[PDB]
Amino acid sequence: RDLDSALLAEVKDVLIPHERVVTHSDRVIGKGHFGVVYHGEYIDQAQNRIQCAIKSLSRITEMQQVEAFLREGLLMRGLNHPNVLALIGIMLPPEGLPHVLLPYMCHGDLLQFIRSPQRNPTVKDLISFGLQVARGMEYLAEQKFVHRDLAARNCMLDESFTVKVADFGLARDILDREYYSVQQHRHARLPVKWTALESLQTYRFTTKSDVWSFGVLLWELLTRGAPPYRHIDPFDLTHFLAQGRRLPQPEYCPDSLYQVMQQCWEADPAVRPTFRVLVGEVEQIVSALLGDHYVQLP
């Protein structure tokens, strides 16, 4: 189960040798759809030791998929934006699965931030976070990356509460259909309810299906973390959306933003706006707000 020397050379700029990395397998941060995240440490190029997070991927086993992942890793390694979480690199233990090294984000994820009873976010605070997500997504789209798993939980917060979009480059067209399937009814996975109607049908994802996901993300923000479509069996979800029903306008969501959400969820992907346009629209909404309300927990 070893890589071709040629591959190893091709993807050298993203591989970190296992002997430059410690995974604290007893310091588990949490487990998700696509692997387990641990505290860890690696040695940089200056020979300094850096604390980080390390995610061992559970769904990448076949060698063709491992190779595909590393080549995609090499692309991601070159991504650089304030609102996008850096990929430090990838590590292959001699026998075992690909590990992704990520900057440790000390303030956790947006979903937990907004759900914290110890905080009192305003509407304007919440839309401002949304704008930061839009900016990260605009950059990813420009770089020809489709997230496939965009949601408030995958927007991380650093020491200065800068939002970093994370966990792109993991889910794939077709291969990961299990996480997007509705045939398990109330055993279906979280991503179903963030996924564009057409992608529920085909397991093919585009930037326009990410735009749909972003609409649901905005709805999360302005409900401070309500579960989308709480009372709908996922089995009925495609039918609900095909009738043209959508998430309802949150109590303190301005009409201008609800309109953007509605654009994001147009049934025709071509009609949905680009992230570039969303950035502009959301920026305009922020600047044109009148007054400000606290927002309650759901």
Ligand X SMILES: Nc1ncnc2c1ncn2[C@@H]1O[C@H](COP(=O)(O)OP(=O)(O)NP(=O)(O)O)[C@@H](O)[C@H]1O
| Residue of 2, 13, 44, 149 marked catalytic | 149
237 binds, among Mg ion, ligand X, none (CB under 5 to 8 A by kind): none
Taking the complex as a whole, how short is the minimal distance between the CB of residue 37 and ligand X, in angstroms?
4
167 binds Mg ion (CB under 5 A): yes
Q: Which residues bind ligand X (CB under 6 A)?
A: 29-35, 37, 53, 102-105, 108-109, 149, 153-154, 156, 166-167
Find out whether 192 and 237 touch, Cβ atoms under 8 Å: yes
Nearest Cα neighbor of 217 from 158, 267, 288, 163 is: 163
Note the residue count of the chain.
Answer: 298
Task: Select the residue whose beta carbon is closest to Mg ion and give its number.
Answer: 167
3-state secondary structure of 189: coil
125 is catalytic: no
154 binds Mg ion (CB under 5 A): yes
| Other CB atoms within 10 A of residue 63 CB | 13
Please say which residue, 33 or 282, places its beta carbon nearer to ligand X.
Answer: 33
Please say which residue, 131 or 155, places its beta carbon nearer to ligand X.
Answer: 155
Q: Please, what is the angle between helix 207-223 and helix 275-287, to 10°?
A: 30
Q: Tokens in use for 297?
A: 């927990």
The amino acid at 269: P
Taking the C-alpha atoms of residue 69 and residue 60, their distance in angstroms, rounded to an integer, is 8
Please say which residue, 30 or 96, places its beta carbon nearer to ligand X.
Answer: 30
Residues in the site for Mg ion, rule: CB under 5 A? 32, 154, 167
Annotated binding site for ATP: 29-37, 55, 102-105, 153
